[PDB]
Amino acid sequence: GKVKVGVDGFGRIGRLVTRAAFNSGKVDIVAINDPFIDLHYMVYMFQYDSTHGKFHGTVKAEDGKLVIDGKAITIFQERDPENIKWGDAGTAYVVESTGVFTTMEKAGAHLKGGAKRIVISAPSADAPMFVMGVNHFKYANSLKIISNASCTTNCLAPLAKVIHDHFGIVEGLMTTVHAITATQKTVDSPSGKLWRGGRGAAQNLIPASTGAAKAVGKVIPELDGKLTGMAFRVPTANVSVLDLTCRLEKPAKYDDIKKVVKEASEGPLKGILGYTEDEVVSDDFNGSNHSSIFDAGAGIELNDTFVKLVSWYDNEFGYSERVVDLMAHMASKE
Amino acid sequence: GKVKVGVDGFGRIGRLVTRAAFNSGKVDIVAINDPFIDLHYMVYMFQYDSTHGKFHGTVKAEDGKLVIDGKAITIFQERDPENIKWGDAGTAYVVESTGVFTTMEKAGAHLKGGAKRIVISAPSADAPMFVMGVNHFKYANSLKIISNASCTTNCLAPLAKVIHDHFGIVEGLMTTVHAITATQKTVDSPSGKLWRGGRGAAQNLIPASTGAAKAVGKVIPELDGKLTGMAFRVPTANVSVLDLTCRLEKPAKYDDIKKVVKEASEGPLKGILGYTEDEVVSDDFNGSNHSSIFDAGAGIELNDTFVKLVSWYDNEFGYSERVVDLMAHMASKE
Amino acid sequence: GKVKVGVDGFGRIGRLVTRAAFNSGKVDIVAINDPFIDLHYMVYMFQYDSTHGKFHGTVKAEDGKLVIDGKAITIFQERDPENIKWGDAGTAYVVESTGVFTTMEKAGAHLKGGAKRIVISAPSADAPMFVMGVNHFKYANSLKIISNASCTTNCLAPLAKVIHDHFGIVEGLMTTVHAITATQKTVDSPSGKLWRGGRGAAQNLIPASTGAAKAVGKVIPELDGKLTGMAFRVPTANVSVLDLTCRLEKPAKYDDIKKVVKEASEGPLKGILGYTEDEVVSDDFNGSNHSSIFDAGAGIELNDTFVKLVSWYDNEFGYSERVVDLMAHMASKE
Amino acid sequence: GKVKVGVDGFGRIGRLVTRAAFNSGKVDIVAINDPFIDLHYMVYMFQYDSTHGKFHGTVKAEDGKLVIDGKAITIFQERDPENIKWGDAGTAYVVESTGVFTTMEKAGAHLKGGAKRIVISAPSADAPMFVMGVNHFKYANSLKIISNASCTTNCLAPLAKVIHDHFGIVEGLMTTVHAITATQKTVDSPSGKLWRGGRGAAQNLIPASTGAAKAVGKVIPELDGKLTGMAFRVPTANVSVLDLTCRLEKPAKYDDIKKVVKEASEGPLKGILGYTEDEVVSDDFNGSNHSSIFDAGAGIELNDTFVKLVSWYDNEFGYSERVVDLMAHMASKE
Ligand SMILES: NC(=O)c1ccc[n+]([C@@H]2O[C@H](COP(=O)([O-])OP(=O)(O)OC[C@H]3O[C@@H](n4cnc5c(N)ncnc54)[C@@H](O)[C@@H]3O)[C@@H](O)[C@H]2O)c1
Ligand SMILES: NC(=O)c1ccc[n+]([C@@H]2O[C@H](COP(=O)([O-])OP(=O)(O)OC[C@H]3O[C@@H](n4cnc5c(N)ncnc54)[C@@H](O)[C@@H]3O)[C@@H](O)[C@H]2O)c1
């Protein structure tokens, strides 16, 4: 036990959030809303992930539900959340994956079955948006639902504080070379919405859009017009890195940026960031037990004004860990 | 023009049937039935294949349909063949990619949609089953609907006729080191029927089921119990190889066995079999313009009655080429 | 500490054997013979492997050598082992990777610098050959050097005992779909010796030779003429599986083979084998903390006489763990 | 026949120079200098490329050399150009793949081997450096030896001329999401110079260094400080894309910028640049028959003086094509 959660979308994102909430936070029991994965599937699926290792403990199928390490967890069939329950297990704060659901209307929708406060894994046009890094006093009890900015978007945000607070930034752009997602396809094919030209996998270096800015601004207003993005998603299954290029107000040294985040990561942020003088460590990370991580070295080049800077990801997980990070910030706090 | 065709499932298997029907045969004029793949997609989609290259000549859409090298082709979305026109064009010979649509029951359905005869890109429970390799007088007018053995099942039938009739064969088992399917997934996940793990993609060498057994049986009655098999799906997008092991009646010498197919390959078969003393060409094939292709060398080792032998695929395509080769022969008779 | 080892070829195979000897056995201190990896490189390299995770502990660069978890380890430059020392550290029993070195002449050669008994990672034409599985009383003090059959070859051997001891086997062949090796190349290229047509990586399903038999017979004489092989190495970096097909003396049931190894793995072997009724678990393993592992289910089909059977690998590691397995069998025993 | 050529490093870069020199130019007759790649390999090796397809026409070896479409070609092994003949054939224009052989010092050496002028497939410390894009009157007889900018460095030079001269540009940084190299490794390992991790292949999105800076500088003096960059090597075998970010003098509109290259691309450049409104074609290119190719759409976003822009590669080949295009122009003058 701990807090008091339920989850929507036993899948990738769901599993760590189910996975983590338990071992990192723990924070209380729960329940599982998973139409299209059954009693049993949850045992395997959750437990065995090719990208992070297997589970451990004992994830088993006992009475009406699953016993993840004994702490009695349930599976809820329904497709259409209002539809399911959630009231049973008393699952006051729930997180959702899914795809579709995102927006006050819908996430806001859950509560009919039970819910209280809902945290979502992904942005939304419509609705309160956060992250670990900047969130501060922003989260207000007054608030009923909350989102955790995207992979991209949450890891960007940490760099922002340290760097725009200390050296200016005026006009900055980025790209992220990313790990494959749910949505990237085998062989060839149709797609859908933003195309994401769904014509790869294994085979091509796939250029793509993201709202690095939107997101990054919402989180640090200041920034919030002075930033935008795109990405090329490559075949890597787990982990990704972010490239930031900047033009800045106060003069920098490369030596300088590096130690700003070094001293600054040292104290407030701790949880998201890093600073690995370390030396090209490629892609390791993959649930390193960090959120956004930057390093010195990488593709840095300096000059007064313009500079180039790279931070990183470990999407999937890092991510799922700043969600539970915030599930306790919002539960304590409201 | 040529025969007179229509097609189910503009996709992977679809594009070639269309692609080749045209280049290889032409077999006239046609039409396209594809819910989810709209007017324009068909131009890009068909045109562009990560796997085989891109198309060429031109693939544009003018009035109401697409112009395939001018050959006025059409697009019908229709979700459920019954529902789709089909007399429209006057295409008595349509071929079903699809997935689900197996069996006389539904294949026959289209017929009421419009249709006449239909070839199916994939095996079937109940219903006539053929392949070019073995096909022979088998095919006769009584016939209105038909199928061309599986990717893999069409490939083994060839090796067999040349092997069984010339050498004996008592008990033979198989494995197919296969290329990726439609059904193979990125990350890890739910799945379905026959299971298949929906558990990998780029990471695992996936264990799997196949029906070479029943399949080759039909195709060549005699065989038809003296066989069964399984396969392992690997990251490999296009092309796969087949492993057959046998125990034969009349003794062989690997020199002799490889011999058989050579002199035999030259004569009745040609468009099916191969024979490359050449020297383990890894996996090029991939639109080689071959059905199944064997070679001497490979993983060949001998002893009077025991021997292992190995063939190949060029699946996707090779297949795509025998449909047409089947469409060809089919029309002819009737 | 523990036994008293040194190692030749800090690389893949070397690292687990350096890695394992320490955490599994521990068995004493050591020293490292690595021309073409320096003081420092050993810290990273060893510690960080993309295929198994990172190290832990603290692998650091202190006085004249490396301190792996404090237990004082050294690095020895020289290329030509007679050439190096080995006498320093008193490294009585050493294991070698390398490539080249294999044969009594050469491995036998070491001793000039120091050495006593040498264990090698890989077969040899010339010389005592073992494995964990069959080795028994065979290892005789009388013996100065010993080898641990190949990836392939060591995992085969476990299946052999259980299955030929209990049900006959007369005429049996196999293939193994394997993980990439050191020797498999990026893009295109020359090669060398057995070609292994060194024209792939990522890109093709590469057919190959192995001496499944030779090896398997040396280990269980009996077998030793009645078995041979080939393999197709695929893009998977870590782990591989073995396919065995058999014709047998006593009648089997599939149900039966399975429980023979089940009860038999239960008691003597324990260390190598498994029997996972478990259900397609693809490729997980990857240092599962097992050597050869078989399962029921997989690609099994039955009939009296002929049968098909699949066991597995986790090369790299499993392997490196039956080496230390035997380093203690040969040290205790001689 | 055509010009009159010879070549260093039958490999990757080698085969195309030879491949294309023939198809594209021909530029006559020739000879091959390749220690490790014997008489016959050259037939298979050249002929067969995993990456581009296979060759065609015919690639056989008759008397003393190889018959390239009949065009009597030769094979010289020679380890050290000095050592290799070269007047033999009478090939005053030889082109160096190689690796190490950079610089006037050695390139000049061959000359004593036999030679006259030599083009080098790769940058160089000291020595004339060119590329087609910018090349112009730059090239003049004084010249005996020359180089064609890097895979990546040849690709940016084009974007620049069209961008710098038409729009301003103050400060610009870059990243290249690159395809795999010769130097990229399978498993993990030693490595070398510039480091590069020799740490991955199929598993990691590798951080890396490049000299677009110096490189594009030379090629277009003006630029030549207002640039520098780094790249990330990914599993992707052939083709890569380039990311350039700039701050310009005269304001742009993304509509306007993309505009420039269009009207400009049509006219002076043609064989270098591109312009595909077309729509993120992921990575097909791969022997598209293009040098560097840009497009509108991609990861394009605008603001008066700040803008990010993106080009492409077709490295391997595209390159292979400008050598010849360079060999072409080179011979001409002299
Ligand atoms: N996956 C990544 O790499 C990454 C990184 C950061 C953020 N994200 C975000 O996290 C979200 C979760 O996606 P994922 O990749 O973890 O999922 P996934 O595809 O692996 O599994 C999601 C499953 O949940 C089910 N789902 C949700 N509610 C359902 C209902 N009632 N009926 C039917 N289906 C329902 C599924 O749709 C789906 O099969 C994404 O939409 C995105 O917003 C992804
Ligand atoms: N790697 C696998 O997948 C697998 C599985 C089972 C068995 N094996 C066996 O294990 C052996 C070890 O190869 P690996 O893949 O672990 O190595 P690796 O390529 O990763 O590293 C080996 C390094 O050791 C050095 N080496 C050995 N002695 C040296 C000396 N004095 N001078 C120069 N170089 C020397 C290297 O040559 C080489 O760079 C193989 O040859 C094979 O017999 C491999």
Ligand SMILES: NC(=O)c1ccc[n+]([C@@H]2O[C@H](COP(=O)([O-])OP(=O)(O)OC[C@H]3O[C@@H](n4cnc5c(N)ncnc54)[C@H](O)[C@@H]3O)[C@@H](O)[C@H]2O)c1
């Ligand atoms: N994929 C391979 O590598 C491979 C190789 C050889 C043979 N095959 C064979 O090809 C068949 C499938 O072709 P594919 O793999 O290219 O599939 P695909 O996904 O590329 O195309 C088929 C798709 O078309 C659509 N469809 C068409 N008409 C429809 C309608 N009226 N109603 C509903 N859905 C409709 C669906 O999206 C369906 O999934 C397999 O069953 C098998 O027999 C596959």
Ligand SMILES: NC(=O)c1ccc[n+]([C@@H]2O[C@H](COP(=O)([O-])OP(=O)(O)OC[C@H]3O[C@@H](n4cnc5c(N)ncnc54)[C@H](O)[C@@H]3O)[C@@H](O)[C@H]2O)c1
């Ligand atoms: N590999 C890519 O994807 C790529 C793309 C674009 C440009 N490049 C350029 O191509 C160059 C290298 O060509 P490659 O990548 O095809 O290499 P490669 O390995 O395929 O071929 C070069 C090899 O030829 C041999 N060689 C030739 N003559 C020799 C002699 N006399 N003495 C000693 N060794 C000799 C060596 O084995 C050498 O490593 C790079 O330096 C770079 O400038 C590479």
